RNA sequence: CCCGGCGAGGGGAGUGAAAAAGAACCUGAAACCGUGUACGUACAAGCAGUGGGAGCACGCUUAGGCGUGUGACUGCGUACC
RNA sequence: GUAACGGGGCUAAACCAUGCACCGAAGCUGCGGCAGCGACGCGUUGUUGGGUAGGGGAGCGUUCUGUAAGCCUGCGAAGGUGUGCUGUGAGGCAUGCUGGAGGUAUCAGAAGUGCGAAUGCUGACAUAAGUAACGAUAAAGCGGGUGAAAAGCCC
């Protein structure tokens, strides 16, 4: 039995989550958490924070235990961008986009 | 268009396509290059036309037995019921009745039969010979829109 | 055993059975057709030659079917010279078993 | 429709071909149709059905007229001025087997298949080949 | 004789031209008016 | 400077080609503790070979 | 009486996309790529039914010339030698004859050489 | 009820005909961005297709072949307005 | 950069003469099909069909009006997305999934009736790129606190 666990709206670049995503996918849930614990980016502990709720889901919702418990799926989506406005100079305006992304975790046995 | 007539950008220099009004046909919220105006859609026909496609609907009703004559056409009381109950009798569903004289309680007994329409011999028109499956004619409206037509 | 026979402008070398595809006969399907002009018959070591036919050499088959092939479009475009045109086209093919070959 | 050869059940034979005196543009013509495959009746153009050839005595190929020593081999570095040349006879000293190689493999199809044709080709400078392991038979060009 | 079985008399109602619609219309692009010069112009065109 | 045509979606993907992260190879195990570690880092607890160093 | 042009735009545009299937990068995905992508895949198949017939006849040439040579002969005067033994089997079965039957191909060889004698 | 910061967000439960109708809410196209699977691709030169074409995978099944995807190799080939 | 045979190579694979073979085009012929025009058997025969500007002819589809208080549709409309079939083309038909309330034959009628370009207009989203940069080079260090987390907050 699947469970997934979602983080939406992320404050993150889908880019910059799918670095960490791809050191995961596929691994014991319990290596994926050790993995996550030492590297050193923001989006790690984005995604460790939704690994451990599918496993929470899996144990609570679905009676799985965690020893059994395989990273199956992960994926970031791209999000909504909050578009924002930066003066430049001689009083030309840039767009920035502040990207969001949609990450979803899949634990099974 | 409401807005003004100030053009959007200059002419030169700014690397944008060359605008003259914000109301251009070409931009959002512009105007309708060849917007509309109310029309009059009435056509002339001619007097002798107008005759003479009347007689050949008359003429096509009785080869294709849609025109009924009879002597006399009329109702106790306005009372659609009655009506209703009268062009069961003659096997009619979807008529046109004219009359010599448009009586005053046909013409209420048919109003709520949309299926049904009650005129007076000078108020035909070519449409409605054609639009309703059969034409049923009083003796006397018979002779006034032969005298129209002649 | 096969032979060499022409039909529809085309040549075509057959062994008794096989299905064959030719350009459209006026023959309705279920009807036999004979093929008279035989070019080449080949038993075995035994190869007869037409010169351009083989005498006494005949094939008959069966009109299995009658259809049209595979669409093709055709495509016709000049380069700035404001003109394109397009065209459809399935050629008519008449399908035959081949029943006896006899030389 | 038309036979086409395949690639894994194309029949390739071994023969050797001694250059000793054959004029090497009349060589290398032959050894190009057949490290093609033109003398098959199985020939395909985007199939090698060609077979290998072991030339021998490659230093012993001859040319005609004053190429021996007026036939000049060029190339080029890739670095500017770096356009360098050889004659025939200063090739044969130094690298006999290239002038075999050089004018077979302009005579070969340009691209993909045609250097893969070229690889069956073993040319030696001298008497001796080393592969009697594959059994080539002997071919009189 | 019904209202959905009336016909114009053949060659009555021939279909008006519509310029500037493809190349297959054959009056594509220029609609007719060839190339530059003042008759191709909106509102172009010499005097009576 | 500027590029004159758009780059594709497969020349992105080639020059992220060596973007990848690599994960810690493995954890050592503090022999007293138990606690998984960065090698030569202190533990979570403040072991550090054994011992408690903080 | 306003016509919204959504409907049929969508319709043509998936026509044309449905026909670039298996192009490279904005070939199969961008319309105004698709398009021009599209009009030369016909140009190149209306050209190419031509040359189909030149391609084959060629190849069938050059494996007669082939099995012509294992006999003795020369193309060219293999051709003439059937045409004055008054054969008249076409390049495309003959060319199937040199592979699949080269006891017949000898024997298409023999009458050649005959004829020429 | 559960994970989480007494968060954001989510998973269950429940409502409902429907919750990929959950309020960032009818339908939900396209560009654009991903995950998965099949096939190709690290000796190979160019409008990227087209004609020819092997191999592989997966379907069907007169068991002859066919269909679908891919496309090694090869002829030709300098977008559109 | 060979660089004044397209290349390899060639002493003919060069040149002159004579001859017979063959290759070679969308030319010609063969086979099948469509259409225009010329005589009418409303039979089949002759012939034609490269095209810019441009002229002529004939159609497809879209929205809306009548036909329609009809017809189709919650036993699933429009729209969306696949698949199959079909016509010379614009196109048409059928049907799986999505959708959840509309649609509309036929024959006529009317047009805001068809988009890839206009440095077109509006919105969305790419690219460069996880690149440049993070705004005075007056400058930080450590201990404790609080906190899910402290280089930046508090002491
Ligand atoms: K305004
Ligand atoms: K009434
Ligand atoms: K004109
Ligand atoms: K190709
Ligand atoms: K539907
Ligand atoms: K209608
Ligand atoms: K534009
Ligand atoms: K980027
Ligand atoms: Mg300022
Ligand atoms: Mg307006
Ligand atoms: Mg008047
Ligand atoms: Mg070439
Ligand atoms: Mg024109
Ligand atoms: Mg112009
Ligand atoms: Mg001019
Ligand atoms: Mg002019
Ligand atoms: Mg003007
Ligand atoms: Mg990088
Ligand atoms: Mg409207
Ligand atoms: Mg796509
Ligand atoms: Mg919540
Ligand atoms: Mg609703
Ligand atoms: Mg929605
Ligand atoms: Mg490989
Ligand atoms: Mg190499
Ligand atoms: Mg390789
Ligand atoms: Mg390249
Ligand atoms: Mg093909
Ligand atoms: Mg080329
Ligand atoms: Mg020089
Ligand atoms: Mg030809
Ligand atoms: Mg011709
Ligand atoms: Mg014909
Ligand atoms: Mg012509
Ligand atoms: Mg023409
Ligand atoms: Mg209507
Ligand atoms: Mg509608
Ligand atoms: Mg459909
Ligand atoms: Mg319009
Ligand atoms: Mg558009
Ligand atoms: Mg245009
Ligand atoms: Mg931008
Ligand atoms: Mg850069
Ligand atoms: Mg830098
Ligand atoms: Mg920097
Ligand atoms: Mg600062
Ligand atoms: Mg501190
Ligand atoms: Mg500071
Ligand atoms: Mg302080």
């Known amino acids: 039995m699947e469970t997934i666990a979602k983080h939406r709206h992320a404050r993150s670049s889908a880019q910059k989550v799918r670095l960490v995503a791809d050191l995961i996918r596929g691994k014991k849930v319990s290596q994926a958490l050790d993995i996550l614990t030492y590297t050193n980016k923001k989006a790690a502990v984005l995604v460790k924070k939704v690994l451990e709720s599918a496993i929470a889901n899996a144990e609570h919702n679905d009676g799985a235990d965690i020893d059994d418990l395989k990273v199956t799926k992960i994926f970031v989506d791209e999000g909504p961008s909050m578009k924002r406005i930066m003066p430049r100079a001689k009083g030309r305006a840039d767009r920035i986009l502040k990207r969001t992304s949609h990450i979803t975790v899949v634990v099974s046995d | 268009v409401t807005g003004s007539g100030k053009k959007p950008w200059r002419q030169k220099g700014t690397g944008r396509a060359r605008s003259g009004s914000i109301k251009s046909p070409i931009w959002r919220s512009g105007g309708v290059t060849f917007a509309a105006r109310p029309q009059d859609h009435s056509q002339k026909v001619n007097k002798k036309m107008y005759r003479g496609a009347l007689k050949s609907i008359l003429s096509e009703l009785v080869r294709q037995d849609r025109l009924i004559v009879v002597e006399k056409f009329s109702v106790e009381a306005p009372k659609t019921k009655l009506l209703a109950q009268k062009l069961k009798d003659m096997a009619l569903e979807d008529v046109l009745i004219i009359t010599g004289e448009l009586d005053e309680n046909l013409f209420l007994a048919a109003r709520n039969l949309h299926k049904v329409d009650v005129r007076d011999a000078t108020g035909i028109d070519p449409v409605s010979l054609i639009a309703f499956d059969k034409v049923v004619m009083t003796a006397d409206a018979v002779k006034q829109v032969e005298e129209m037509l002649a | 055993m096969y032979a060499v026979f022409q039909s529809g402008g085309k040549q075509h070398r057959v062994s008794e059975g096989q299905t064959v595809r030719l350009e459209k006969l006026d023959i309705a399907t279920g009807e036999t057709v004979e093929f008279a002009e035989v070019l080449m018959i080949a038993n075995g070591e035994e190869v007869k030659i037409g010169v351009p036919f083989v005498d006494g050499g005949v094939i008959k088959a069966e009109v299995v079917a009658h259809g049209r092939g595979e669409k093709v479009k055709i495509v016709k475009f000049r380069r700035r010279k404001h003109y394109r045109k397009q065209q459809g086209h399935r050629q008519w093919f008449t399908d035959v078993k081949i029943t006896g070959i006899s030389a | 429709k038309t036979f086409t050869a395949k690639p894994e059940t194309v029949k390739r034979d071994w023969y050797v071909v001694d250059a000793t005196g054959k004029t090497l543009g009349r060589l290398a013509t032959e050894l190009a149709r057949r490290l093609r495959g033109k003398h098959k009746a199985e020939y395909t153009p985007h199939v090698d059905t060609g077979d290998y050839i072991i030339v021998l005595n490659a230093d012993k190929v001859a040319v005609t007229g004053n190429k021996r020593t007026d036939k000049v081999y060029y190339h080029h570095t890739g670095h500017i001025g770096g356009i360098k040349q050889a004659t025939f006879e200063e090739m044969i000293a130094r690298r006999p087997e290239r002038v075999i190689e050089i004018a077979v493999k302009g005579m070969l199809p340009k691209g993909p298949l045609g250097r893969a044709m070229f690889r069956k080709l073993k040319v030696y400078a001298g008497n001796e080949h080393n592969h009697a392991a594959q059994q080539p038979q002997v071919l009189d060009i | ?48 | 400077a500027v590029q004159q045509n758009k780059p594709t979606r497969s020349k992105r993907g080639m020059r992220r080609s060596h973007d990848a992260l690599t994960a810690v190879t493995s954890l050592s195990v503090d022999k007293t503790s138990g606690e998984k570690h960065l090698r030569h880092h202190i533990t979570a607890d403040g072991y550090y070979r054994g011992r408690k160093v903080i | 009486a306003r016509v919204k042009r959504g409907v049929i735009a969508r319709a043509r545009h998936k026509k044309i996309l449905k026909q670039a299937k298996g192009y490279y990068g904005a070939r199969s995905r961008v319309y105004r790529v698709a398009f021009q992508a599209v009009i030369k895949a016909g140009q190149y198949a209306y050209r190419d039914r031509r040359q189909r017939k030149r391609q084959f006849r060629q190849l069938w040439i050059a494996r007669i010339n082939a099995a012509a040579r294992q006999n003795g002969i020369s193309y060219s005067k293999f051709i003439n030698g059937l045409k004055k033994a008054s054969v008249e089997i076409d390049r495309k079965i003959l060319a199937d004859i040199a592979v699949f039957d080269k006891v017949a191909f000898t024997a298409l060889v023999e009458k050649a050489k005959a004829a020429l004698a």
Not at chain 5, 25 to 40: F, V
């Open chain 5, 1 to 48: 004789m019904r209202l959905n079985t009336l016909s114009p008399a053949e060659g009555s109602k021939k279909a008006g031209k519509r310029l500037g619609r493809g190349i297959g219309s054959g009056l594509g692009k220029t609609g007719g008016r060839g190339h530059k010069g003042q008759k191709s112009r909106s509102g172009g065109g010499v005097r009576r």
